[PDB]
Write a protein that binds this ligand. Structure first.
Ligand SMILES: CN1CCN(Cc2cn(CC(=O)N3CCOCC3)c3cc(NC(=S)NCCc4c[nH]c5ccccc45)ccc23)CC1
Length: 124
């Protein structure tokens, strides 16, 4: 409710602890395979951040999968940048990664990140 006491730092603190759990492989429940690379994560965080992962895990036919093989055309560094963003709220857009990050974000259906990439290319 809008009447309750607001903890303005709570959401970021929760996400920080979720990233800490990922760094220790605690309760991770899926491995994301991107070409020769593998990334372990929590399905709930992937679903919350990505329309692709939401559509995958919300379907009862795929919810229980422990391995997800992404399109092998996806660049592993671009995916790692977006996975870090999911868990940190910080997006590492550089001149050398912007195109890979953007195309990956389109594939992952993260529109907010896609729109932000469109401003990075514009502001360059
Ligand atoms: C106009 N739409 C165009 C297509 N977009 C796909 C999409 C993009 N994201 C990432 C995203 O928007 N954000 C913004 C906030 O910061 C994190 C990343 C998504 C995340 C989820 N995950 C969950 S749990 N959604 C629960 C509600 C829900 C969404 N669709 C539903 C369908 C059926 C039932 C419920 C829902 C699902 C879909 C997307 C959505 C908007």
């Amino acid at each position: 409710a809008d009447s309750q006491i607001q903890f303005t730092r709570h959401a970021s603190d929760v996400l920080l602890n979720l990233n800490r759990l990922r760094s220790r492989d605690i309760l991770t429940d899926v491995v994301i395979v991107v070409s020769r690379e593998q990334f372990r994560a929590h399905k709930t965080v992937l679903m919350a951040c990505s329309g692709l992962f939401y559509s995958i895990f919300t379907d009862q036919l795929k919810r229980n999968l422990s391995v997800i093989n992404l399109d092998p055309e996806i660049n592993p560094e671009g995916f790692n940048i977006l996975l870090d963003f999911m868990y940190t709220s910080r997006l590492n857009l550089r001149v050398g990664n912007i195109m890979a990050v953007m195309a990956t974000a389109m594939y992952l259906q993260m529109e907010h990140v896609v729109d932000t990439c469109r401003k990075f290319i514009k502001a360059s």
